[PDB]
Design a protein around this ligand. Structure first.
Ligand SMILES: *[C@@H]1O[C@H](CO)[C@@H](O)[C@H](O)[C@H]1NC(C)=O
Ligand SMILES: *[C@@H]1O[C@H](CO)[C@@H](O)[C@H](O)[C@H]1NC(C)=O
Ligand SMILES: O=C(O)CCC(=O)C(=O)O
Ligand SMILES: O=C(O)CCC(=O)C(=O)O
Ligand SMILES: [Fe+2]
Ligand SMILES: [Fe+2]
Lengths: 219, 219
């Protein structure tokens, strides 16, 4: 079976050919970081920084999302949420709309799980997530966010383009530690608990556009 | 109204005379610690140490619990839990059995709430808890616990007697920070997130008996 009615049909091949999918899309340094020979960094207390996705997957995902066009989001009230009201709105494209939800859940179950288990000993995960999306930060439509918390055990923050080449902005700023992240990488992922002890707030961007992929795993 | 069929009837007076109850049982240094002139300590990352209860309440509660006598607990399976199986058993007396549950929830809603809001800015609490109990650590019946996590946003750990005068043991040991708590005080309370980033394990006791009050608030 092979669905050809896609811009980039190979992205949906995580269920038929896992091995070739891993070789092509997953970052080449992921295995070394998992086995524990460095790579993974802790710039600030209890936040981790490891590579997950290569350049092909980032580019392909960004192009596929931009092909959708309907960049919903911005209003305080919501229609995609059962409650019907957002605490803080952003322009986002949830994966349920584009059909990539199940494959993303499979990726979370397969690759993110074991590493976050090794990073935090004594924690057992099922990688069950409900909210996962991609946000677009542009100086024209909407600026960065106000300080807030998250409704999850921990959050995964993956970038999807290069800093300086296509945008000039910043990452995250932690209020309780005066920690500022300056230059996030392209395929690297950020891990941090997001319920109690991490009062973070994203920095504003002034030039160009930037892409970020978020997923509130273990709600 | 006044129920006299109790060993110490004044403990149930948190609903009729809040002011006198506060003057008699609540620690005299609580207000200063809440207003922020020191007192509250942070011996290890993201764990706090503030006074809550005076000596009268600790003694009165310990005597009232010991009057109950039926120190249940010890078996891996459970009957007080809907699931019917404990991850780790301890000899405990849940407050539902002694009837002090509602007053304890009122105390959590009134006094613990505002302080844990000031301690962690940007966090809003309702102080809704389900599991809260008192454990007895004796070298004969059961030793200390194996490393574990907790099923709550954060836990409150209040001691109920003096170290050295009545027992010779230890407090908590954090695996992810090599943090050891040596001498917990009598009326002081311990606050720490207990889901993801705090892999703690209690120390063993060799001489005498020690009492601890725990409450898994915000499950
Ligand atoms: C993987 O890590 C090696 C470290 O020796 C580095 O040279 C290489 O550029 C990395 N691959 C990337 C960043 O795609
Ligand atoms: C309250 O704090 C003061 C600090 O000046 C101390 O002298 C006093 O003993 C404390 N009360 C206690 C420990 O009951
Ligand atoms: O962009 C950031 O650093 C903040 C984004 C964030 O935490 C969120 O989108 O929930
Ligand atoms: O004895 C202690 O201080 C740790 C016990 C504890 O937190 C627990 O038993 O869950
Ligand atoms: Fe967040
Ligand atoms: Fe605990």
């Amino acid at each position: 079976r092979y669905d050809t009615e896609h811009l980039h049909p190979d992205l949906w091949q995580i269920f038929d050919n896992p091995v070739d999918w891993k070789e092509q899309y997953i970052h080449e340094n992921y295995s070394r970081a998992l086995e524990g020979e460095g790579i993974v960094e802790q710039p600030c207390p209890d936040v981790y920084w490891f590579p997950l996705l290569s350049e092909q997957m980032c580019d392909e995902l960004v192009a596929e999302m931009e092909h959708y066009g309907q960049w919903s989001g911005g209003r305080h009230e919501d229609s995609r949420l059962a409650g019907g009201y957002e605490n803080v709105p952003t322009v986002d494209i949830h994966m349920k709309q584009v059909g990539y939800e199940d494959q993303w859940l499979q990726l979370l179950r397969t690759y993110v799980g074991p590493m976050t288990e090794s990073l935090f000993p004594g924690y057992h995960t099922k990688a069950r997530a409900v909210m996962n999306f991609v946000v677009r930060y542009r100086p024209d439509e909407q600026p960065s966010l106000r300080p807030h918390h998250d409704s999850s055990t921990f959050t995964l923050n993956v970038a999807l383009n290069h800093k300086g080449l296509d945008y000039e902005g910043g990452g995250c700023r932690f209020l309780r530690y005066d920690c500022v992240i300056s230059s996030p990488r392209k395929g690297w992922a950020l891990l941090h608990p997001g319920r109690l002890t991490h009062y973070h707030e994203g920095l504003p961007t002034t030039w160009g556009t930037r892409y970020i992929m978020v997923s509130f795993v273990d709600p």
